[PDB]
Homo-oligomer: A and B are copies of this chain.
Amino acid sequence: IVVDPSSNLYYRWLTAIALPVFYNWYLLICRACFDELQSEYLMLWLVLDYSADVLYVLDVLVRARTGFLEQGLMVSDTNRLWQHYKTTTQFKLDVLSLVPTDLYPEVRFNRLLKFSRLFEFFDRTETRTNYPNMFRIGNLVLYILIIIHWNACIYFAISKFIGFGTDSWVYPNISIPEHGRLSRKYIYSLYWSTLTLTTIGETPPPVKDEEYLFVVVDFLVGVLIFATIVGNVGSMISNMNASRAEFQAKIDSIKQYMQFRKVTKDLETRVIRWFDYLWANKKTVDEKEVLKSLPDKLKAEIAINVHLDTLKKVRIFQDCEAGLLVELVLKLRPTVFSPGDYICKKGDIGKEMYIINEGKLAVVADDGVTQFVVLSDGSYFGEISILNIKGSKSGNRRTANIRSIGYSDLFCLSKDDLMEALTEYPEAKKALEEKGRQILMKDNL
């Protein structure tokens, strides 16, 4: 079998191999430095180390049968997969992490060489999850807890090397039953390392030169840790409200424009209420900028999936070419209208055709509140004035006032957009002109 790195089985294996790597780092430095975790829970550490080595050789096999991409296609032959896995330095890191050094748990510090699986699990979870900033604070707390734990183990090893209870800086005398417990040892070492790496420093001061030097190095490392934590959380907060700051900057610039150009209070509060609607309905980003980073094939497929069943129900586009409808939904433009907004007044130049989506319009009667007919979802208007038929009775002029009752979302197919969409389909252009001429001869010509 061949696994591929983009599937879900690969991410489940990334979790299943990120568990024993974190176990190896954490509990290997703890057992190497504390000497009672290793002594008391010996069968538990034997079981967990056997499980970690089993998952390590299984990771070697999975990396041996993990595919890659050449010429866009996934490679699936195990010989070339094995050679490509072998020529990489990750193969040497895996073999060096699986040397039989068990033939004092510090000999198992080769097992810490599989850190790339933990970093790959963190990267894949960060790109897969839907709470990326919550996972980022989780990863930051995990990294700084690893450093706090490793510094606690280093402090206990240094105080054991100097001597227990010989100094005021080192760990107290473990022959006393209060300082002799493993829980007291680990939690006091963790408290010391936390005070020293959070640059609080309420610890007893050093008395020897190696202790002074270790405390200097520890306080500078804690300074770098605090700077990294603050930088990551600050960039995360700057990313968490970048869209809010962009929309507030746009609102502030438009309000400054409306104050500088002396826009009246009615239009000013109409613009303010429009932006309040645009934020309270989460429409803060425009689709014309949203659909630029996509390729043309996915843009065309999204335009089909949104507008093709709507455009196919238009009476002039019932028997047109599928490629012509593809170009037409590529040239569709969506606009949102406020309540009471006139889409078109009677007597204006008709150069756009609007198809209603998720809205409710009304044909009002000569700048009045009385409505003749109420248009609804899926319907359209302006289907004839944009075709530019010779000998029209109307002459590209709207014969009715259409107001918006609520917030409508129309799709605007312009005259120029239809003319540049009809330039590579001339037979479809003549058929569209024939259908418009037929509709005009039926109703009024």
**Chain A interface residues toward B at CB < 8 A:** 5-6, 69, 71-74, 127, 132, 137, 141, 144-145, 148, 183-184, 187-188, 190-191, 194-195, 198-202, 205-206, 209, 212-213, 215-216, 219-220, 222-224, 226-239, 241-243, 245, 248-250, 252-254, 256-264, 267, 270-271, 273-274, 276-277, 279-283, 285-287, 290-291, 293-298, 301-302, 305-306, 321-323, 335-339, 341, 347-349, 351, 358-360, 376-377, 396, 404-409, 424-425
Contact = CB atoms under 8 A, between A and B. Distances in A.
Contacts of A248: 132, 239
Contact of A323 (B145, B256, B321, B348): B348
Contact of A290 (B257, B295, B349, B405): B257
Given A144-B223, A261-B306, A349-B424, 6 more contacts: A71-B358, A72-B407, A184-B209, A239-B245, A267-B301, A274-B295
Contacts of A219: 194-195, 198, 200
Contact of A223 (B69, B74, B226, B283): B226
A81 to B, nearest CB: 17
Contacts of A72: 339, 358-360, 404-409
25 contacts: A6-B273, A6-B276, A69-B281, A71-B377, A72-B339, A72-B404, A74-B406, A187-B216, A199-B200, A223-B226, A230-B231, A231-B233, A231-B237, A234-B235, A235-B238, A242-B249, A254-B294, A263-B302, A270-B298, A270-B301, A297-B337, A297-B338, A298-B338, A321-B347, A322-B348
A342 to B, nearest CB: 8
Contact of A198 (B223, B296, B349): B223
A263 B293 contact: no
Contact of A141 (B198, B220, B263): B220
Contacts of A132: 248
Contacts of A253: 285, 290
A262 B302 CA distance: 10
Q: Among A215, A232, A282, find the residue whose CB has the most chain B CB atoms closer than 10 A.
A: A232
Given A231-B233, A245-B242, A295 B335 contact: yes
A150 to B, nearest CB: 15
B187 A213 contact: yes
A202 B202 contact: yes
Contacts of A376: 71
B323 A347 contact: yes
A212 B194 CA distance: 11
A260 B283 contact: yes
